[PDB]
Amino acid sequence: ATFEIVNRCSYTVWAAASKGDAALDAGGRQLNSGESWTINVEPGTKGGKIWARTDCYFDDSGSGICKTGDCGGLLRCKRFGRPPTTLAEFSLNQYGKDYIDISNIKGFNVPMDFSPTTRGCRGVRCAADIVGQCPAKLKAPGGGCNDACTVFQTSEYCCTTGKCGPTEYSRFFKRLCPDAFSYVLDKPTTVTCPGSSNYRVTFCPTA
């Protein structure tokens, strides 16, 4: 499947794509404002994620640091990124269907639209000003708005036992972005698409 990743933000982002134990395509790339990066994701990939990283420095070997979404200090991510990260999540070709969502379970850094470019399903978006409205206790100094599990490390926020409810903090994310997951047991906002669809991920879609 093809994913076209577009940075419509006025600032540079470093896109990342991983399935947790491996990079997807090249795994990461700088995207200046307006730039597009097209990647190919192998059919049947389960648990893939795409995210943006902000305020990065990398040397000529591809090693450095980002203030949001850092994946072990590499430009080309093989692992997932450090919160806060708005997440585009997908599993492809699962008994003939693709499944996509946006998640704020690991916080929010950059607004996002995640839409199919082929027919048969709808897209999802989280584009509100979550960082500007972020509760003081969740604000991340490097930028972004952390989830409550990352900050407080309780069984209720992290849903450790598989039983948890919504919280004041999850409701904050859900109010601003109803179509993204706000906690582990949120009513699913997953979209079902035809198997082998193609997609666009747009950072700052309203910019």
Side-chain angles (χ1 to χ4, degrees):
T2 304
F3 286 73
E4 181 168 7
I5 303 169
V6 181
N7 181 22
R8 190 175 293 157
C9 308
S10 64
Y11 46 91
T12 300
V13 304
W14 287 258
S18 175
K19 63 179 192 78
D21 62 356
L24 298 180
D25 197 291
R29 217 200 82 181
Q30 182 171 331
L31 291 179
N32 296 329
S33 177
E35 289 190 330
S36 301
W37 178 33
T38 302
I39 64 168
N40 288 290
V41 173
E42 213 191 341
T45 294
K46 199 180 187 229
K49 305 191 195 302
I50 291 166
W51 69 103
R53 301 169 285 175
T54 61
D55 290 311
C56 301
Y57 162 75
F58 293 104
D59 68 18
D60 309 300
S61 77
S63 185
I65 186 164
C66 301
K67 299 194 170 183
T68 69
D70 187 77
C71 61
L74 301 185
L75 174 63
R76 293 162 279 258
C77 292
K78 293 147 56 170
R79 309 301 193 263
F80 293 137
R82 187 172 193 267
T85 52
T86 320
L87 294 170
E89 306 185 308
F90 49 91
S91 295
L92 309 179
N93 308 100
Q94 304 293 303
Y95 302 106
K97 297 300 186 186
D98 288 359
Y99 296 96
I100 68 168
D101 67 78
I102 292 176
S103 171
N104 286 322
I105 289 169
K106 294 293 184 195
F108 177 99
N109 62 340
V110 175
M112 177 183 291
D113 182 277
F114 187 7
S115 286
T117 58
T118 54
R119 200 170 159 80
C121 51
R122 63 147 190 150
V124 283
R125 176 175 296 195
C126 176
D129 188 13
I130 286 178
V131 180
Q133 299 299 351
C134 186
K137 290 176 182 174
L138 299 185
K139 291 193 167 227
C145 188
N146 279 314
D147 65 285
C149 170
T150 294
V151 174
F152 294 102
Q153 296 278 277
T154 70
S155 64
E156 192 63 18
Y157 293 138
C158 301
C159 216
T160 303
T161 71
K163 301 188 165 186
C164 60
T167 67
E168 275 311 282
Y169 296 123
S170 73
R171 286 184 186 95
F172 160 77
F173 289 96
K174 197 63 167 181
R175 195 166 297 114
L176 293 169
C177 285
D179 293 333
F181 280 89
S182 67
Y183 74 109
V184 173
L185 295 184
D186 206 352
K187 167 167 184 173
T189 48
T190 305
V191 174
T192 304
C193 291
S196 297
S197 298
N198 295 324
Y199 302 92
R200 191 187 222 247
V201 179
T202 308
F203 304 121
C204 303
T206 73

PDB file of all heavy atoms in Angstrom, residues 105-122:
ATOM      1  N   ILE A 105      -3.735   8.420  22.686  1.00  0.00           N
ATOM      2  CA  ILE A 105      -3.405   7.639  23.879  1.00  0.00           C
ATOM      3  C   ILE A 105      -1.977   7.908  24.342  1.00  0.00           C
ATOM      4  O   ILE A 105      -1.664   7.759  25.533  1.00  0.00           O
ATOM      5  CB  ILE A 105      -3.657   6.143  23.595  1.00  0.00           C
ATOM      6  CG1 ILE A 105      -5.157   5.882  23.498  1.00  0.00           C
ATOM      7  CG2 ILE A 105      -3.008   5.255  24.657  1.00  0.00           C
ATOM      8  CD1 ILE A 105      -5.503   4.509  22.959  1.00  0.00           C
ATOM      9  N   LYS A 106      -1.093   8.303  23.419  1.00  0.00           N
ATOM     10  CA  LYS A 106       0.266   8.714  23.741  1.00  0.00           C
ATOM     11  C   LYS A 106       0.439  10.227  23.596  1.00  0.00           C
ATOM     12  O   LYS A 106       1.548  10.719  23.348  1.00  0.00           O
ATOM     13  CB  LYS A 106       1.270   7.961  22.866  1.00  0.00           C
ATOM     14  CG  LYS A 106       1.323   6.466  23.119  1.00  0.00           C
ATOM     15  CD  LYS A 106       1.864   6.172  24.473  1.00  0.00           C
ATOM     16  CE  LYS A 106       2.011   4.700  24.689  1.00  0.00           C
ATOM     17  NZ  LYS A 106       2.200   4.438  26.120  1.00  0.00           N
ATOM     18  N   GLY A 107      -0.645  10.971  23.770  1.00  0.00           N
ATOM     19  CA  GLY A 107      -0.599  12.409  23.765  1.00  0.00           C
ATOM     20  C   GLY A 107      -0.734  12.978  22.366  1.00  0.00           C
ATOM     21  O   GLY A 107      -1.097  12.298  21.410  1.00  0.00           O
ATOM     22  N   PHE A 108      -0.437  14.269  22.260  1.00  0.00           N
ATOM     23  CA  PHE A 108      -0.654  15.024  21.030  1.00  0.00           C
ATOM     24  C   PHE A 108       0.516  15.967  20.853  1.00  0.00           C
ATOM     25  O   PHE A 108       0.932  16.618  21.811  1.00  0.00           O
ATOM     26  CB  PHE A 108      -1.949  15.837  21.152  1.00  0.00           C
ATOM     27  CG  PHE A 108      -2.251  16.714  19.983  1.00  0.00           C
ATOM     28  CD1 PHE A 108      -3.151  16.301  19.018  1.00  0.00           C
ATOM     29  CD2 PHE A 108      -1.683  17.968  19.874  1.00  0.00           C
ATOM     30  CE1 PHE A 108      -3.465  17.105  17.939  1.00  0.00           C
ATOM     31  CE2 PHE A 108      -1.977  18.781  18.780  1.00  0.00           C
ATOM     32  CZ  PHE A 108      -2.897  18.345  17.824  1.00  0.00           C
ATOM     33  N   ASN A 109       1.061  16.029  19.637  1.00  0.00           N
ATOM     34  CA  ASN A 109       2.076  17.033  19.336  1.00  0.00           C
ATOM     35  C   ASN A 109       1.710  17.888  18.140  1.00  0.00           C
ATOM     36  O   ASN A 109       1.828  19.128  18.208  1.00  0.00           O
ATOM     37  CB  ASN A 109       3.481  16.426  19.223  1.00  0.00           C
ATOM     38  CG  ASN A 109       3.637  15.405  18.109  1.00  0.00           C
ATOM     39  OD1 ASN A 109       2.669  14.821  17.594  1.00  0.00           O
ATOM     40  ND2 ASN A 109       4.901  15.179  17.723  1.00  0.00           N
ATOM     41  N   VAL A 110       1.250  17.263  17.060  1.00  0.00           N
ATOM     42  CA  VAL A 110       0.980  17.941  15.793  1.00  0.00           C
ATOM     43  C   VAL A 110      -0.412  17.536  15.318  1.00  0.00           C
ATOM     44  O   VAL A 110      -0.768  16.351  15.413  1.00  0.00           O
ATOM     45  CB  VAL A 110       2.051  17.555  14.755  1.00  0.00           C
ATOM     46  CG1 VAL A 110       1.757  18.117  13.396  1.00  0.00           C
ATOM     47  CG2 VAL A 110       3.435  18.028  15.204  1.00  0.00           C
ATOM     48  N   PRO A 111      -1.227  18.461  14.812  1.00  0.00           N
ATOM     49  CA  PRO A 111      -2.526  18.080  14.238  1.00  0.00           C
ATOM     50  C   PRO A 111      -2.357  17.242  12.972  1.00  0.00           C
ATOM     51  O   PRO A 111      -1.383  17.374  12.229  1.00  0.00           O
ATOM     52  CB  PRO A 111      -3.197  19.430  13.948  1.00  0.00           C
ATOM     53  CG  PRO A 111      -2.057  20.412  13.863  1.00  0.00           C
ATOM     54  CD  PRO A 111      -1.001  19.914  14.779  1.00  0.00           C
ATOM     55  N   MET A 112      -3.380  16.441  12.686  1.00  0.00           N
ATOM     56  CA  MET A 112      -3.259  15.388  11.690  1.00  0.00           C
ATOM     57  C   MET A 112      -4.604  15.090  11.038  1.00  0.00           C
ATOM     58  O   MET A 112      -5.644  15.115  11.700  1.00  0.00           O
ATOM     59  CB  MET A 112      -2.734  14.121  12.379  1.00  0.00           C
ATOM     60  CG  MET A 112      -2.617  12.938  11.482  1.00  0.00           C
ATOM     61  SD  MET A 112      -2.073  11.478  12.379  1.00  0.00           S
ATOM     62  CE  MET A 112      -0.397  11.912  12.787  1.00  0.00           C
ATOM     63  N   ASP A 113      -4.562  14.804   9.732  1.00  0.00           N
ATOM     64  CA  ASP A 113      -5.650  14.172   8.997  1.00  0.00           C
ATOM     65  C   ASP A 113      -5.109  12.872   8.410  1.00  0.00           C
ATOM     66  O   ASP A 113      -3.978  12.827   7.913  1.00  0.00           O
ATOM     67  CB  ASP A 113      -6.123  15.094   7.860  1.00  0.00           C
ATOM     68  CG  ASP A 113      -7.283  14.517   7.078  1.00  0.00           C
ATOM     69  OD1 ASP A 113      -7.024  13.707   6.179  1.00  0.00           O
ATOM     70  OD2 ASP A 113      -8.453  14.852   7.382  1.00  0.00           O
ATOM     71  N   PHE A 114      -5.901  11.804   8.490  1.00  0.00           N
ATOM     72  CA  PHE A 114      -5.528  10.477   7.994  1.00  0.00           C
ATOM     73  C   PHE A 114      -6.691  10.007   7.131  1.00  0.00           C
ATOM     74  O   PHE A 114      -7.751   9.661   7.658  1.00  0.00           O
ATOM     75  CB  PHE A 114      -5.306   9.544   9.186  1.00  0.00           C
ATOM     76  CG  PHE A 114      -4.754   8.174   8.862  1.00  0.00           C
ATOM     77  CD1 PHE A 114      -4.313   7.805   7.592  1.00  0.00           C
ATOM     78  CD2 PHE A 114      -4.675   7.233   9.873  1.00  0.00           C
ATOM     79  CE1 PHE A 114      -3.805   6.524   7.356  1.00  0.00           C
ATOM     80  CE2 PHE A 114      -4.176   5.965   9.634  1.00  0.00           C
ATOM     81  CZ  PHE A 114      -3.737   5.607   8.381  1.00  0.00           C
ATOM     82  N   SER A 115      -6.515  10.037   5.805  1.00  0.00           N
ATOM     83  CA  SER A 115      -7.614   9.785   4.893  1.00  0.00           C
ATOM     84  C   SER A 115      -7.213   8.769   3.834  1.00  0.00           C
ATOM     85  O   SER A 115      -6.070   8.779   3.358  1.00  0.00           O
ATOM     86  CB  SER A 115      -8.030  11.079   4.169  1.00  0.00           C
ATOM     87  OG  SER A 115      -8.741  11.956   5.030  1.00  0.00           O
ATOM     88  N   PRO A 116      -8.137   7.913   3.415  1.00  0.00           N
ATOM     89  CA  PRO A 116      -7.887   7.094   2.230  1.00  0.00           C
ATOM     90  C   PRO A 116      -7.881   7.957   0.980  1.00  0.00           C
ATOM     91  O   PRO A 116      -8.565   8.982   0.905  1.00  0.00           O
ATOM     92  CB  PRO A 116      -9.070   6.122   2.222  1.00  0.00           C
ATOM     93  CG  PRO A 116     -10.165   6.880   2.849  1.00  0.00           C
ATOM     94  CD  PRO A 116      -9.497   7.702   3.949  1.00  0.00           C
ATOM     95  N   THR A 117      -7.076   7.542   0.000  1.00  0.00           N
ATOM     96  CA  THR A 117      -7.045   8.181  -1.317  1.00  0.00           C
ATOM     97  C   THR A 117      -7.707   7.305  -2.354  1.00  0.00           C
ATOM     98  O   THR A 117      -7.756   7.661  -3.539  1.00  0.00           O
ATOM     99  CB  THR A 117      -5.605   8.458  -1.769  1.00  0.00           C
ATOM    100  OG1 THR A 117      -4.872   7.227  -1.797  1.00  0.00           O
ATOM    101  CG2 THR A 117      -4.932   9.459  -0.843  1.00  0.00           C
ATOM    102  N   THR A 118      -8.190   6.153  -1.935  1.00  0.00           N
ATOM    103  CA  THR A 118      -8.958   5.253  -2.764  1.00  0.00           C
ATOM    104  C   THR A 118     -10.350   5.150  -2.156  1.00  0.00           C
ATOM    105  O   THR A 118     -10.604   5.605  -1.036  1.00  0.00           O
ATOM    106  CB  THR A 118      -8.257   3.893  -2.820  1.00  0.00           C
ATOM    107  OG1 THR A 118      -8.038   3.428  -1.485  1.00  0.00           O
ATOM    108  CG2 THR A 118      -6.902   4.005  -3.508  1.00  0.00           C
ATOM    109  N   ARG A 119     -11.259   4.548  -2.903  1.00  0.00           N
ATOM    110  CA  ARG A 119     -12.659   4.637  -2.527  1.00  0.00           C
ATOM    111  C   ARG A 119     -13.008   3.594  -1.466  1.00  0.00           C
ATOM    112  O   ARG A 119     -12.280   2.620  -1.247  1.00  0.00           O
ATOM    113  CB  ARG A 119     -13.529   4.448  -3.769  1.00  0.00           C
ATOM    114  CG  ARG A 119     -14.939   4.977  -3.623  1.00  0.00           C
ATOM    115  CD  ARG A 119     -15.657   4.977  -4.966  1.00  0.00           C
ATOM    116  NE  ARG A 119     -17.107   4.994  -4.803  1.00  0.00           N
ATOM    117  CZ  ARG A 119     -17.823   6.083  -4.536  1.00  0.00           C
ATOM    118  NH1 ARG A 119     -17.228   7.264  -4.398  1.00  0.00           N
ATOM    119  NH2 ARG A 119     -19.141   5.988  -4.404  1.00  0.00           N
ATOM    120  N   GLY A 120     -14.122   3.834  -0.775  1.00  0.00           N
ATOM    121  CA  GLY A 120     -14.738   2.817   0.067  1.00  0.00           C
ATOM    122  C   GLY A 120     -14.770   3.097   1.555  1.00  0.00           C
ATOM    123  O   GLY A 120     -15.325   2.274   2.303  1.00  0.00           O
ATOM    124  N   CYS A 121     -14.220   4.207   2.032  1.00  0.00           N
ATOM    125  CA  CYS A 121     -14.275   4.523   3.453  1.00  0.00           C
ATOM    126  C   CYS A 121     -13.971   6.002   3.635  1.00  0.00           C
ATOM    127  O   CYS A 121     -13.603   6.707   2.693  1.00  0.00           O
ATOM    128  CB  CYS A 121     -13.296   3.661   4.258  1.00  0.00           C
ATOM    129  SG  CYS A 121     -11.640   3.691   3.561  1.00  0.00           S
ATOM    130  N   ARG A 122     -14.107   6.460   4.871  1.00  0.00           N
ATOM    131  CA  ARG A 122     -13.910   7.858   5.210  1.00  0.00           C
ATOM    132  C   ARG A 122     -12.591   8.038   5.947  1.00  0.00           C
ATOM    133  O   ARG A 122     -11.957   7.075   6.390  1.00  0.00           O
ATOM    134  CB  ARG A 122     -15.060   8.361   6.089  1.00  0.00           C
ATOM    135  CG  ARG A 122     -15.176   7.656   7.445  1.00  0.00           C
ATOM    136  CD  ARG A 122     -15.679   8.634   8.486  1.00  0.00           C
ATOM    137  NE  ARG A 122     -15.601   8.134   9.858  1.00  0.00           N
ATOM    138  CZ  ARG A 122     -15.418   8.916  10.922  1.00  0.00           C
ATOM    139  NH1 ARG A 122     -15.275  10.229  10.765  1.00  0.00           N
ATOM    140  NH2 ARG A 122     -15.366   8.389  12.142  1.00  0.00           N
TER     141      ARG A 122
END
